[PDB]
Amino acid sequence: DLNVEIVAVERELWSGPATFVFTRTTAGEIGILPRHIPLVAQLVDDAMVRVEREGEDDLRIAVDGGFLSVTEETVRILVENAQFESEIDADAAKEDAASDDERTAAWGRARLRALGQ
Amino acid sequence: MEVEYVGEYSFEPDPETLFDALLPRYIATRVYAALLEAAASES
Amino acid sequence: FLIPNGTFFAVLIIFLIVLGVISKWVVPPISKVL
Amino acid sequence: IHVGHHTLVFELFGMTFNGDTILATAVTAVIVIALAFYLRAKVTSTGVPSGVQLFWEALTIQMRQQIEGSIGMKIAPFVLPLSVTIFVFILISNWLAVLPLQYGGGAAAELYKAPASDINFVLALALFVFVCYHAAGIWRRGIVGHPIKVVKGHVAFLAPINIVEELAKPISLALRLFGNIFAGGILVALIAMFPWYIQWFPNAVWKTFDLFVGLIQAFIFSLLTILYFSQSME
Amino acid sequence: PNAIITAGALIGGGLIMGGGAIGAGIGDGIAGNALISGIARQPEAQGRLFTPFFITVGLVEAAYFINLAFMALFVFATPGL
Amino acid sequence: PNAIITAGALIGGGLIMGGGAIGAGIGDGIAGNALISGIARQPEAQGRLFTPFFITVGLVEAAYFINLAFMALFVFATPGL
Amino acid sequence: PNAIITAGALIGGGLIMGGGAIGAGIGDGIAGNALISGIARQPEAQGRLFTPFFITVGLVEAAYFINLAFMALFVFATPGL
Amino acid sequence: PNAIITAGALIGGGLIMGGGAIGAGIGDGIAGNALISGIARQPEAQGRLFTPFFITVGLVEAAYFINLAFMALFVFATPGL
Amino acid sequence: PNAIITAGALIGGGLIMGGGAIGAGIGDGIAGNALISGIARQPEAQGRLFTPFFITVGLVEAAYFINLAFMALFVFATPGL
Amino acid sequence: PNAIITAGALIGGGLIMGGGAIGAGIGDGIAGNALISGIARQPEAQGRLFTPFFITVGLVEAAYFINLAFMALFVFATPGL
Amino acid sequence: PNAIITAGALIGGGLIMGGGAIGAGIGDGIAGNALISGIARQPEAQGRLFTPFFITVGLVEAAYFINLAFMALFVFATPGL
Amino acid sequence: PNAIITAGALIGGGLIMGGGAIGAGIGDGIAGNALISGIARQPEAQGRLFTPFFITVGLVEAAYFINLAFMALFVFATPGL
Amino acid sequence: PNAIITAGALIGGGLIMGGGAIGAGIGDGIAGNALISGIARQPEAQGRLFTPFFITVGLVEAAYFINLAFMALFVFATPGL
Amino acid sequence: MSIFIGQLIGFAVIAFIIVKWVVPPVRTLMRNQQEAVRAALAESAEAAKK
């Protein structure tokens, strides 16, 4: 199986193995599953990550400025800032998405996508 | 930065643009490490 | 109709004239405007 | 469809001349000369440029940029006038055919047939360019050095291929211009076989697109002239 | 005897234009595919891509129009007749 | 004599139209593949991508048109008739 | 006499359909490849990706249709018959 | 007699099937290439990709059937017979 | 009279299988290119790549098979003979 | 009469071989291009890549072989003779 | 007898020129696609890319005109006439 | 009789070699495209890439060789003559 | 008698060079696309990439040469005259 | 006679097409360029005055 680790710049966000990972790279969506070739990919400013945890439910994460890496042992998601699906506030994300600033609007819309709006 | 060479993958959308976009992040994370370590030394 | 003719020269001459004029009337003036 | 049969044909100096092609070339030359003279009279460095000044400036800038990006302007100052005159000559020759200068005999006759539709015109332009950049290569490399580089090219063991490609440079550069305009002369003739009440539609669309086709052909011919010069000078 | 030569010339000219059209269409499509891909990746590159484009087109069109010319020679001025 | 020339002209026009259809269809497919890929990559570039497209389509569709004309010459106005 | 013309017209129509089918199939395949790749890379693009597609298909289906028409002329209304 | 007409019809229908087979095979292979690449790059999208796929395969395989509808017309009906 | 029809049928069947083999080979090659590239890039999805593969091949191999069948009908059961 | 059928069968077998060779060469080239790229970017993956590749080459070389068979049936065991 | 010779020579020269047109146009389109893509990615590489490009085109054009050189030999010299 | 069979055999062998050359050239071009891309991306892969390449070329040239042989059989040992 | 033989030889040689031209042009264009892409992506690699290139063009242009040679045998030394 | 009338209708169509869809963009380019150059000369003059 994949050893999935999500590493925020300030801390190691989450390091649970999973069967399948999914996210929108700058070149389009990408789905990583065991024994994928090594890869490095910049995620779109509003990318979101789905991790298909084997036992528990799916794990949907909003990510800001993420970089995905694939290696035979692990799948890394390096992150500037991230939030799991449960902690997202829909109104706050909507308010941020209306901002003209690219970074804040991108983060808000990423939070919306992870929330499943 | 000096480019370091030592004795002994795929990329999207190409290696050059990704490298250019990543170097600022490397600068930011090294400055972050410097600030964290300065806070520790200050304490 | 693919066989050349005397018109060949009759064309070349004319073209040369233009090549001359544009070489000085337009080369000079254009370069000057530039 | 009665291809060929150049009208106004005459004989002089013991050789035959297609009068209609010469007349079309002269018409194009006088249009280009009028544009050049109107520029010369109204060329302003400090004032607001006229329409002809803007046209000439854009064309000269494009050709100069091509020369800069292919072979330095210092090495090739003489090729900018050649490119500009070539472009304007072919462009005006092709675009003057858009005028409704055709009528019915009962076959269709055309008062102004694009000179490029004649083999002599395109062959003359191509051979002039051929001699010009071969002479430029001789000047920049030497009488004996230039042929050696031309045959060798960039790969020595491909010597015959080069010798073909070289001979292909004029031929194509001529025929590419020939067939494109020659073909048009047939379509307008073919479309003339239609009755007037449905002839205008195919004729209209064909000539509307032939404006762009002639523009692109003039641009391509000039661009390939510049490219061949850059190749043959170094 | 002239009828057989004329029919053969018509078939040969049809072959010439069929090959020329195939080559022109496919090569122009490929060159324009490169042009459109470049302008999609770098929309500000359009101006600089028309030079290498019309060069390429200039080459491709040649293979067509040369052929076109020769079809006329096949059709209107059949080499044998 | 007329029958042979007419049959040869029909075959030549069939070749002309087959080649023209192949070239036009494949070139249009390639150019539109570039257009679709670009508009997938850069939706905001949609309009900017329609300039190099219609030029490319203009180049192939021109050839096709010429072909469609010459077949009309072969079939209805058999030159060697 | 009419037998030769009819056989030539049938061969020409067969060529027209062969070329039209090749062009239509390959161009539609290429355009659909672009569409499928675009939809795979991102779902929300689908709505827009059908505008360039149906344009390209419209160009590739037109050519076929034109050929489809001319065979109908070649075989049912054989010119020069 | 019409034996020449029958031979011409057989050759024409053979051309129709040859072109239709080439176009269908190559075009649907290109569409399947897109489908396989999309599923490989995003295995969870399989069903999604089957919408555009079967559209282009619908266009590519339609051209075949139409050709199949005409070869049958050529050899079994032979309109010019 | 039967000799001419037989020769025409042989030529038509040759065309049928020529087109069928071209389409089959090229389409199978393209689909296999997709499969090999996807297995190289996403080896774990090898199984999920075979459903869209055998489908595509299933289409391609269908186009060939039909053609082959008709070739038989052309050569062994020559219509109009 | 046998001469006409033999000439037609030779032409048809030549068509079958031309189509089979085109399809086999191009499909093998495409599959091998996939294999070469996969082994370039994944040096240790070549083993796995040889599984789909030989499948693809299986479907390609198969078609060729079938053609190679029927040409013999056309040339040595001419059905119509 | 010379009528059959001239018709066959014209058809052979038409085949030569059609194949040359197809090969030259498509190969030039592919090489120019590479050139345009490389210039779009790295404009400064323009002058660098024209060295290999004009080698490859230099070969492709040589395939064309050599064929043309032979077509003349078919139609104007007609060996075996 | 003999003349007709010989002419048909010559045309069939010409078709054999034309298809074989098309397949060989295009397959070699595609395989060498993969080889060149791999060597450009992976210098040290140059040694490892020549094994798949030689396999691909082996599958391509073999087809050509086979065609060549049969073409000889057509023109030097014309069956049915 | 000889007239038909050498007319068929002319058509067969035209087919040989048509196929050779198509294969050589397209394969050289594809190999040149690879070389140009490699030089654009790896400017310092040019000297290296000419060894894989000329090998590829070596196999491609070889086929053409053979075809050319055989056309001479077809045309100037036609078998079975 | 008829050929001339048909071609003249076609040329009227061509003129209408270029005037409606081709002339406007070319005129906009010329006005942006010529007008812009006028503006620039003006700016240069004002700057010299300054």
Ligand SMILES: COc1cc([C@](O)(CCN(C)C)[C@@H](c2cc3cc(Br)ccc3nc2OC)c2cc(OC)nc(OC)c2OC)cc(OC)n1
């Ligand atoms: C059923 O619809 C059509 C369309 C056509 C076209 O040829 C396109 C066919 N193709 C897509 C395969 C078409 C055309 C012509 C062009 C000519 C030049 Br030069 C340059 C670009 C062109 N682009 C073109 O379409 C983008 C055309 C031709 C024409 O002829 C009198 N009148 C038109 O009306 C303005 C016309 O546009 C609709 C033809 C036709 O007749 C059988 N039926």
Ligand SMILES: COc1cc([C@](O)(CCN(C)C)[C@@H](c2cc3cc(Br)ccc3nc2OC)c2cc(OC)nc(OC)c2OC)cc(OC)n1
């Ligand atoms: C199975 O059904 C069909 C379909 C057709 C088509 O040609 C498409 C075939 N293809 C998919 C291979 C089809 C068509 C025509 C188009 C013409 C232009 Br210009 C531009 C786009 C087109 N797109 C088209 O389909 C997307 C068509 C043709 C037609 O002819 C009188 N009438 C139609 O009814 C409006 C029609 O639409 C259904 C033909 C046919 O004949 C046997 N049978």
Ligand SMILES: COc1cc([C@](O)(CCN(C)C)[C@@H](c2cc3cc(Br)ccc3nc2OC)c2cc(OC)nc(OC)c2OC)cc(OC)n1
């Ligand atoms: C020497 O072996 C073969 C194989 C064939 C095939 O056509 C493959 C051709 N290919 C490789 C180009 C083959 C086939 C047919 C298919 C039909 C459809 Br619809 C969809 C998928 C198919 N997939 C197929 O192969 C996976 C086939 C045909 C057939 O005909 C009665 N009987 C079969 O059962 C034994 C059979 O194998 C399932 C034909 C043949 O004839 C000389 N000889």
Ligand SMILES: COc1cc([C@](O)(CCN(C)C)[C@@H](c2cc3cc(Br)ccc3nc2OC)c2cc(OC)nc(OC)c2OC)cc(OC)n1
């Ligand atoms: C092996 O069996 C087949 C299959 C066909 C097809 O043509 C596909 C062939 N191809 C894969 C090469 C096929 C078909 C037709 C389509 C028509 C349009 Br419009 C749009 C999409 C189509 N997609 C199709 O399959 C994806 C078809 C045609 C048909 O006509 C008698 N009856 C069918 O139902 C009984 C049928 O199956 C739905 C033909 C055939 O000929 C003997 N034998």
Ligand SMILES: COc1cc([C@](O)(CCN(C)C)[C@@H](c2cc3cc(Br)ccc3nc2OC)c2cc(OC)nc(OC)c2OC)cc(OC)n1
């Ligand atoms: C020695 O060179 C060859 C090779 C062949 C092949 O056809 C491959 C041709 N290729 C390059 C297009 C080849 C073949 C056949 C296959 C059939 C099916 Br179904 C599925 C896969 C196949 N894979 C194959 O090769 C991987 C073949 C055929 C055959 O027939 C009597 N005897 C063979 O054993 C000696 C044989 O080699 C295994 C033919 C030939 O003609 C004289 N000469």
Ligand SMILES: COc1cc([C@](O)(CCN(C)C)[C@@H](c2cc3cc(Br)ccc3nc2OC)c2cc(OC)nc(OC)c2OC)cc(OC)n1
């Ligand atoms: C006037 O120029 C040419 C060149 C040729 C070539 O065939 C290439 C044609 N192509 C580029 C389309 C050429 C050739 C042959 C090769 C043979 C093998 Br095996 C492998 C690679 C080859 N590569 C080749 O060029 C890359 C060739 C042929 C030849 O004929 C006796 N003598 C040669 O040496 C003196 C020779 O080399 C230069 C033919 C020709 O005929 C009119 N005229």
Ligand SMILES: COc1cc([C@](O)(CCN(C)C)[C@@H](c2cc3cc(Br)ccc3nc2OC)c2cc(OC)nc(OC)c2OC)cc(OC)n1
């Ligand atoms: C250079 O001049 C040649 C070359 C050939 C080849 O066919 C290759 C042609 N191609 C590149 C277009 C060649 C060949 C044959 C192969 C057969 C199989 Br199965 C599998 C791979 C092959 N690879 C091959 O080269 C990669 C060949 C054939 C042969 O037969 C008499 N004798 C050979 O030994 C001397 C031989 O090698 C040189 C033929 C020929 O004849 C006119 N002249």
